[PDB]
Task: structure prediction
Amino acid sequence: ITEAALVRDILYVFQGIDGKNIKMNNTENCYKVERSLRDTAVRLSELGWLHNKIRRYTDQRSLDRSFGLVGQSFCAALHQELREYYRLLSVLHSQLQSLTLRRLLVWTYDPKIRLKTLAALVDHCQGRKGGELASAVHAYTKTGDPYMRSLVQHILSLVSHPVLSFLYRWIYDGELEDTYHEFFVASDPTVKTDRLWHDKYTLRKSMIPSFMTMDQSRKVLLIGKSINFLHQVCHDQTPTTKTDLENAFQGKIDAAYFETSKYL
Amino acid sequence: PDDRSWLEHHVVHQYWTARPSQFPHSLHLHSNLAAVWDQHLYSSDPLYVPDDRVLVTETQVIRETLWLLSGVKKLFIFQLIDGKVTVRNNIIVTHLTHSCLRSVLEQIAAYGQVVFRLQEFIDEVMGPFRTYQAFMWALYKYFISFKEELAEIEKCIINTTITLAIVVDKLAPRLSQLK
Amino acid sequence: KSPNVLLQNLCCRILGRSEADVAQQFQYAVRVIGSNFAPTVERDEFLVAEKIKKELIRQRREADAALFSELHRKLHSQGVLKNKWSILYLLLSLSEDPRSYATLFAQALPRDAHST
Amino acid sequence: LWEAALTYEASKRRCWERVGCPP
Amino acid sequence: AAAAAANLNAVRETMDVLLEISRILNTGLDMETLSICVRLCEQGINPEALSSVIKELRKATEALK
Amino acid sequence: LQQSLELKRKMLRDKQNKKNSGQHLPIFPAWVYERPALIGDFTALPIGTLPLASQESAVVEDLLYVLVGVDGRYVSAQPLAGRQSRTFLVDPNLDLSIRELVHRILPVAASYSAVTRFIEEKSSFEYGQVNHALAAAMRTLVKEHLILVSQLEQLHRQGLLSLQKLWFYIQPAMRTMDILASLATSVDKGECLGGSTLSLLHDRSFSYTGDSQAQELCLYLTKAASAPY
Amino acid sequence: MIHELLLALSGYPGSIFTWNKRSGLQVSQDFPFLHPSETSVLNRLCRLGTDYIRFTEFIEQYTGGLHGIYLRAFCTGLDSVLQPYRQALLDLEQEFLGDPHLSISHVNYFLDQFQLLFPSVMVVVEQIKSQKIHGCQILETVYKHSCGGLPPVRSALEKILAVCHGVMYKQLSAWMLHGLLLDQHEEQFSLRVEILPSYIPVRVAEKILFVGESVQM
Result:
């Protein structure tokens, strides 16, 4: 059988799509050819074997509305990363009409490493939301590969935008809201009269972020508690009175802490 | 020769008369689509069904559609059978499989009936009530500026890339108004 | 086209000067073009494509390494050029960054196991 | 000469019944 | 006849592609200078030689200014 | 194959007992070790009855297959599936000339596989930030080897590469991949990690200075490994 | 072919893709001119344009069933969220004129971001039909989806939500200054408070009612 057929088929199985004489029978086995070319073909189709997993996981978790905002950011990130792989593939189709450079092994060599990582990241964030998910992308920033550290640091900047938007409502106003469990403070459903201060706000220690210590969470909890007591009881109202950012938390929480207590 | 050559070359005339039209093109399916679809149908053993769709090129369809959306009558494409303008199914371009064509010309014929009934109402005052007269005058006043817009678009065809899907979205802030 | 007039026209494009006002730069041009005018290393546009990709991975731009791929595709789709090696290698040599190890890089064929 | 002559404006008439090189 | 003028059209769009590859590598050529550079490379010449030529000729108009 | 499964868990217990200020250290999934096609190393008629000037083309295509890991049709990569050792068998029916010429080209296959094992086992997080930066700069020279073999593949395709040219062409890359294989052996045997494999590279940089081609190799590798430290 | 797709993604099914109101744009025909695996690509691509038809059917019937000026504000925003899906379909045919090598994969690539807009806004279009919303409580039901999880549907609904607040500044402008209400029918009596969204508190509503009643005297 000619080589030209299997080259078109292996060009289709990079997307995750069976060829004409390449078929997929068992999902835990790699793609099988229907002699030397058949032996060569398997190492390239390992990519499609993993691509099915990484597509299916970010398919399911993105349409799941119990998975929450944190992590649907991660799905949006993974979708943006699979996009650029299809950007490669759409050009690679047009480059035929030799292209078989060790049967495209030097072509697939650099995607093979940008796809092992997302396969690690989907399984280390499995069934986890909030700060448990944030630590699970921060864990792969402990690598010593600079290309890998630069790769994962972008996705962490994607996941940390919802939590930081939740932070800036909690410091400034004292308001707290969630219909899921992704924040580090857990409010009491009872809305107390003057027993508020001790019981209205409790610390959710399971969902403290991977850039915040326990010290940081408790210290900003005191500020949010005070600025909530200022509104729900004292009835005073004054407007414009309230990943790393390279030590900008420890200044903003510091200024807000002083202002609320001195005015109280 | 002398006069028939000046006709034959520079005037379009083949398709709105009874004559087999010859048209060169760049073959190979992406715009040879009608012929490839007929080859597949005949290879799948129809049996015969000798379909006769004469031919037209694409841009002439655009200008006849614009003249129908204007409100003037008597065009070759768009036959009508009771006063409602409908598709002529005797035509093929080089593509559109005769089914996409039959749908898109039906969609613009739906607006053609809208403009045709109102120009019929406008004609039945032009050959005494004095409020109906003011009402049809209001519709006439809308229609003259409307026909100016399509007529200036038609001049830009003689000179950009234009197709059917471009001019329908171009006439979108007016075809919404006509309804 | 005649080579000598082609070099002094280059001296007239980069220097803001007439073609009877420059003969000194074109004399330097004759010094370098003579004795390096025939190939001294074998031609391969494949290598210089993967060395422009080597420049673009040096700046960690995979999307522009794939833009160079569609550009290099259009170059083959038309095919009106004959020496594809020299102009891309020339463009590669004048590379700057818009924002060690070079003896560990690979080399092309020396034209000593082949006729010069 | 040919590439000084290259600098004339491109055509604005495109054919969709000709997908390969419609000037 | 007809193809001999559309062939040079097929030269122009490649000449436009190299106009992108020139500006993303920050080269001192413009579009007119690159046309002469393609006329140089079709006849066959080491581009290290031309590059050394321009690497001196560019430093001999700003060293006198 | 089997023995690599111990080391990661054994060091994971040490780094798990050390760290009580943070939990859940990252590791690769299981199939990353399971599949033999993530690495390069795993109708047919006897070559002996062929003429000689067809045998040369056949054997050079087979050897170019062997360089990148996959087997040739007439030389088999022997299954051991254990340590940095790997052996190869050519058939005994080939003419004695071409085999004596082939046998001196074969060790660059063995210093390609033994390097390849070190890129998979020694990139996990029980070997640390220093070994990750060491390994991430050793994969680069493997990629440059892939570049070299793709260009010689192109030359061979049009019938313009022979064994006598090929023998001359691969020798500097043979020396590079031999340096990489010897250092991989030395790190694997002593079970070294941390600053103990930055003392090793400080000595190894002085140790090999034969043409100052390899001295600059290990000079780049010690700059690469010392960046996380 | 590659313009035949561009009418399938628009409102022209043709003979190749047979539209049905239970599962539309179907192809199960055998092609000697297309590869066997090509069908698979089209099948995934079939999920996109199908939704563009269904949204379009929803815009035709509206503007004793549902009534309201609230439904005349959701729909207008659904036009604007489909506007770049018009523009990024006009761009393709411009690109296809010169280039003959642009296959289906570039269309799948370029319109990959509408496999995140469309499925997260289709639940919003199904939600108002499965449970009927016709009062002033449309702003809550849209406002919980603009928080979203993904950036495209997060902005796409905010474009819609601004005009739903804007129609609510025609009622709260005529009532408070000119003493005019029921110039447009809803869906002393001055009540609107039950259908008002719950993130709007009771204090501002009791202020609004008194200010409106004072103009009558």
Q: What stands out?
A: Chain C touches chain A at residues 60, 62-63, 66, 69-70, 73 (CB under 8 Å). The radius of gyration of chain C is 18 Å.
